Symmetry: D3
Subunit: 246 residues, 6 copies
């Protein structure tokens, strides 16, 4: 009737194998010791934030799955916010486990979810490492925008660098894909780039290159696919599953 | 009648180059003969392709920008950088930048923000001299109204906690909302006004209880740049126009 | 009535200022959040080992002072031994604070304690960074060994590289001072080197250089001064103070 | 005689000297240019994209400037002085500047092969692992080797005569700068005589210690020999006016 | 029967037994000091360390080829004074060749780690590390029997960190030389119940106790000399050459 | 004289702290510095032929400008074996003063500045390497001095015309790196140094810097001869030169 933590981890890693993760990505077990324990309640979150972790404790979550890792940069002192987070997780024996870029890259992962939403014709990986998707959007720019506003984020920032003809090349990248080097790279591959976390220098670069950029936010472009992932888990596992920051 | 070198001298008197932080690519970006006579000065935030085309169109012969032309060095000349350099060289337009030295100098871009908010006892925010922090003598709502009226009509507010009157306000013009900046400024201020907020930084601010106001990179720098432009206009017998503001 | 964690820390840092610590040394607060909390029982240990931390919990220690830091190398995952250690400290809100090389180097610190035991004439810092002491031992090698056996370690390992005349130059370094580069450096400054943690290649180097090495162990050469430090805290603070691994 | 698009010239050149033959880090390919559909009437070839070469190109109506050496080895982020003057000339005239560097040194019938064939090296092999240089037996006397050097490459090469050289010796050749201290040490294990360019003092001393005979026929002349072969090759195959600018 | 050998023939024989490509990355194996390898060799000396006393003893005993396990230098130098001056002077004055097989001798079949694995009759032995250093397998006996073997054949009073109880038929890891660094302790704690090696220091002792890994320090010197004696016997059996040991 | 006293005299003239970062100056090969020295040899290079000659002529202390090794080693075979064997077997001390001798007062760069009688000489680089000042004469007069005192057939890169009373930079040894050409072109009309190579020649032409390559060997040996005379005037020692 009940699942062990290691069995949940096994199921997740079958869906999104850890070796799909890009170099250096802190995927896998973040916080935990005994993985033979039976799990009462699974929580899903975009971020292992202090609010999310307090909510997990509040809601009786003992297996906390997040997309973003707890720490990118390693530390050797435990004070302030990280102290408050670890204290809640350790005192309550809550396991924290992450699937980050392996969940972005895998089949039916976060980037596939976007490609399917826009029904990309002949989709291909955007980067060599498997991040992102690119293909033809069979419709007008205005229809593309409507889908974006309806399903992802209502007031996306649009950098309308040039006019966009019907049946354009659409690149999608869930999360933060709007770095300067990404703008330069994707400008060679697509007419329109849908992603998150636009900043000023990247906006200027897109305008110079004629790449239309749509910032539908880091949060919404990932949560769209995370919601799919949650349904997938719910359909397949005999486990109570809740979302914490979406 | 003014030579390019005396415009440069005037600017460098206001914002000495050694105020720029280590590694900042400040000073002459593109140019050769600085004895050249300058009839029309253009000021811009960005040396973008459209700014450079506009410079050429308006007959600008000295183009001042806040952001340097290149941050990372290159050794091939194709695409966008080719198009930009071709316009500058073809018209012998001098391109000169004052970047963090203009952020840091007295009455520079960060001081302009500190003065707008009338910060009491203002101090540099970082050791390298970037940013300002001091007491805002008023309510958070009064601080917001000033922001909306003079800087940006609808800033993003990450309202991480309640803010009492006479709070500590830190300001940094441009991009000051990196993850390490959020962590640092959270120890020094109740409210942080800057530009270019992204997701991980928003989350950090909420965790730390630092209220962040993103009035955009563009608007927080342009506010002080306009003041810098009027200063140049008051002191130089030169036609001076702005190109991207 | 009770003193706060921050005033215990202030007292310690007055004796051994953090800026005395050598470059890269992970000194100061290791684990903790609220330093305004009141402290009823201070525990002192050489090592923040798992057994020391369990003993702290068992004995009701709320402020754990150790000489060695919890971590030298930073981490970004929390499992196994470090998980168990942090869990005990955090669930019980035990503060862990360390003074490492700043306690080695400061006046009347661990190296001064050794120099004073041997009544070194005109003692000087051994290294430029302030680690270790060197001066004249006004007596015979045999008298020096008897002092070592009575006060530090009952059976020290002696690498008797050459004969030692009376009134020789003695270098002392508490803890691990017997690295290969230290042997070479100290051989130019002393006839006899008293420290801890001898290994094979260092023994050979000492023999080649004619440097007499006395390994009284890493543990005993630090514990000697740590006891002095504990007495000093006990004399000055109105606090219950116990030792955990000595 | 007809006009060619710039991209068609680049294609031909890269067929002869593929870019993936260039050693790690070498800045080969398009140096300065945007539109490669540009129509080319006159191709200029040079060893160096020097200021005098580029001025000569402008003067002579060159539309496509090929050089062996890249314009920049180390990247820059300011454009003043000499580089400003060079770019201004190239951009004002939209002259394309393209380079094939070590990929031209290494390819079949490239600059090093040209030397190896000149000396009729028996069973020639690549000298370095990366494919630079050639080494094989010279079937003749040291004096005959020197005469060949004098007749075809450079009239008065500097000879570091570290030891006597017997007939049928192992000869290593490297066009351009091949006389670094580390090259001397490496080649001394592989050859009796080393023909290259740009000898300096420490390298001379090292060669004398190791007994390696070094012949400095100069960086310029050892590359220009093969570059002339390359120019002749282009002229035979392309219906283009082709001129040389610094040789 | 007893004859002279050229140095290159000795080197070829040693490298057949312990190929240089077995040595781990960065290990300074091979020719340490020497020029002409056609040199005729009458007397081969074997040592753990190319120490000053070993090199003096080599000179005194007329050793023409000095084999050592540890290389003369780990870190490169560009000045020649003090002890290294004294050492090189003795070798060069007498043209004594100094040659080393270090981790290639640790790793090769019947090398120093195999010697330990065979001594403890390890069941189904495997390399302990990826690079081939060390061996690990089941010790078919009690911990006390393991300890008895250690005391009789390796070192009489080994330091024992008895982090936990050890049942019969436990997993034993062995590493000849210095194998008791902190990172080795952490690594081996996942692969064995008991770790036999040398050069224990305080931090490593604490870590072993935390992890429950039983550590036996039978010393760097003795855990290598055990296999080096085997190696010497092997050379003596195969080469018609006078062979002596210098620091064992 | 003891070796340590010779070393003391040299280091008083050319303190080791004047040497640039990373320069391997001081004792190269030696143990006992109480050794009695009857005969001192001076050389530019501690080459194998110099070291053989030192042995042949009975030299006890070998002073060289260039250090024995720039890059460290951990094996001793081939040429370095042969060199060390000669020095150690004979306990010949090898000691070097390299850039500290280039930089010190009346050192190798000052020797050149004094030969050309440079007006108001200044160090060329911040680290003290090289000298620059006005040459009070014609380019042709400068060339004549160069040919008579330094090197008979210097290579001249005549990048532009040179007027009388021009700014002259001098650097003994290897001063013609690409980065040096660019730097010096801002500070001088004419650059006198050694070891010219192709790319540096092209840069000098582009920049209009006249470069005179009087060779690495001759521009250092000129000042080394002066140093040898200075040692000879002051020390009661037999002193010979080995590669000049
Ligand atoms: Fe993300
Ligand atoms: Fe900015
Ligand atoms: Fe310690
Ligand atoms: Fe070349
Ligand atoms: Fe060993
Ligand atoms: Fe030199």
């Amino acid at each position: 009737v009940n699942m062990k933590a290691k069995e949940i981890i096994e199921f997740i890693e079958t869906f999104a194998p850890k070796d799909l993760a890009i170099e250096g990505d802190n995927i896998g077990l973040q916080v935990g010791d005994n993985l033979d324990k039976e799990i009462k309640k699974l929580g899903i979150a975009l971020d292992p934030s202090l609010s999310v972790i307090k909510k997990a404790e509040k809601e009786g979550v003992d297996f906390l799955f997040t997309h973003h890792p707890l720490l990118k940069d390693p530390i050797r002192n435990f004070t302030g916010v990280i102290y408050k987070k670890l204290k809640i997780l350790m005192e309550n024996d809550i396991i924290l486990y992450s699937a980050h870029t392996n969940l972005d890259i895998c089949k039916n992962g976060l980037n596939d979810a976007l490609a399917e939403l826009y029904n990309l014709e002949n989709p291909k990986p955007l980067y060599d490492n498997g991040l992102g998707r690119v293909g033809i959007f069979k419709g007008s720019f205005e229809e593309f925008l409507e889908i974006t506003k309806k399903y992802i984020h209502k007031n996306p920032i649009v950098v309308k660098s040039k006019e966009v003809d019907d049946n354009f090349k659409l690149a999608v990248l869930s999360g933060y894909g709007l770095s300067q080097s990404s703008i330069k790279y994707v400008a060679e591959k697509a007419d329109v780039y849908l992603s998150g976390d636009l900043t000023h220098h990247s906006k200027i670069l897109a305008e110079e290159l004629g790449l239309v950029v749509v910032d539908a936010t880091h949060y919404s472009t990932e949560v769209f696919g995370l919601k799919k992932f949650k349904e997938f888990l719910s359909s397949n596992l005999d486990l109570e599953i809740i979302s914490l920051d979406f």
